[PDB]
């Protein structure tokens, strides 16, 4: 890059006030119904959230053991923001290498560990379960049929994007971006800390963001500098962070960190979710970095609402019986 990341962490110009600090027991369905989840939320503690996390001294090797030593993972080259691939055993080997000996900066932010031993060790904030489209919209018998622990597309039976394990070494940086499908994000710092640059998804900023992508000079321009309002917020250990749909953010890792989080679509900001999808469309984002079965999920959402309200089903007879069979469990 050409810009100085160091000063971007020192300056006080990113003093916008977007984030809201909340109590877990205040984060319920009624709150989403009142606000539509438009504001970034931070929970300084876990009380009331209903989350479950592994042992506080959980290691990367423990992650390997739970997902498999030969599990292929998507690794990010920090310097180029490109993507490479190695086994969890190789990644663990790199992560366990002393800080001053690492030949390069690598970042793992895309380890989806659903349907592994790690799955039941980590639990989403309870409220997310009530609104997540995957848990409430997608056909249940399809999701329950999932056996593959990797995100291979041919074996994927549903949007497998609910549980991610992020492992970052000190110095890791993720440039500005909007999570796929315009999904909202829950972000829990298990060990370490993160530094976030936040940008509101206004019409002007989304346009600025898109042109910034097509520009190709994303490594020559700090996006937080050419918007009117940006906030740099530091996330500490034990913190839970909820990112609303469409929010442009970059992230820095001031120390070796272990994060558990996930994405989700909900019914309270569909327009913005569709906005972000079209941006992905126009910027030619490869399908591998996008929300799987996006439009299929959208079709299923319409069916659920129509049925839950008018009692008229638009599923096939076979799909209706599949659901009816599960209602009798």
């Amino acid at each position: 890059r050409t810009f100085d990341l160091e000063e971007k962490l020192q300056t006080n110009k990113y003093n916008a006030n977007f984030v809201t600090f909340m109590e877990g027991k205040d984060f319920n369905v009624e709150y989403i119904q009142r606000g539509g989840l438009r504001d970034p939320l931070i929970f300084k503690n876990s009380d009331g959230l209903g989350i479950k996390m592994p042992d506080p001294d959980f290691t990367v090797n423990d992650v390997k053991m739970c997902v498999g030593s030969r599990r292929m993972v998507d690794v990010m080259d920090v310097n180029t923001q490109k993507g490479i691939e190695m086994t969890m055993a190789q990644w663990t080997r790199y992560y366990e290498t002393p800080e001053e000996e690492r030949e390069k900066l690598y970042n793992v932010i895309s380890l989806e560990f659903s349907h592994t031993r790690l799955e039941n060790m980590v639990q989403r904030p309870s409220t997310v379960d009530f609104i997540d489209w995957v848990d409430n919209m997608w056909p249940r018998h399809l999701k329950e049929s999932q056996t593959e622990s990797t995100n291979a597309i041919l074996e994927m039976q549903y949007p497998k994007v609910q549980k991610y394990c992020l492992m970052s070494v000190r110095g890791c940086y993720t440039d500005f971006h909007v999570d796929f499908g315009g999904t909202s994000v829950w972000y829990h710092i298990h060990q370490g800390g993160k530094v976030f640059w936040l940008i509101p998804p206004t019409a002007h900023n989304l346009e600025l963001y898109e042109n910034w992508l097509l520009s190709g000079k994303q490594g020559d321009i700090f996006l937080g500098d050419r918007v009117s309002d940006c906030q740099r917020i530091e996330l500490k250990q034990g913190y839970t962070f909820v990112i609303p749909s469409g929010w442009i953010h970059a992230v820095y890792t001031p120390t070796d960190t272990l994060v558990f989080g996930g994405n989700f679509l909900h019914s309270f900001n569909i327009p913005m979710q569709l906005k972000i999808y079209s941006i992905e469309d126009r910027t030619r984002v490869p399908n591998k970095f996008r929300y799987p079965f996006y439009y299929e999920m959208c079709w299923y959402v319409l069916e659920r609402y129509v049925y839950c309200i008018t009692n008229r089903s638009h599923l096939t007879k076979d799909f209706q019986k599949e659901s009816l069979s599960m209602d009798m469990e």
């Binding site: 998507d74 497998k160 991610y164 971006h177 999570d179 399908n287 929300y291 799987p292």
Partner: peptide
């Protein structure tokens, strides 16, 4: 080269 999806990367 098995195809994948839902990968998080900027």
């Amino acid at each position: 080269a098995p195809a994948t999806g839902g990968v998080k990367k900027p």
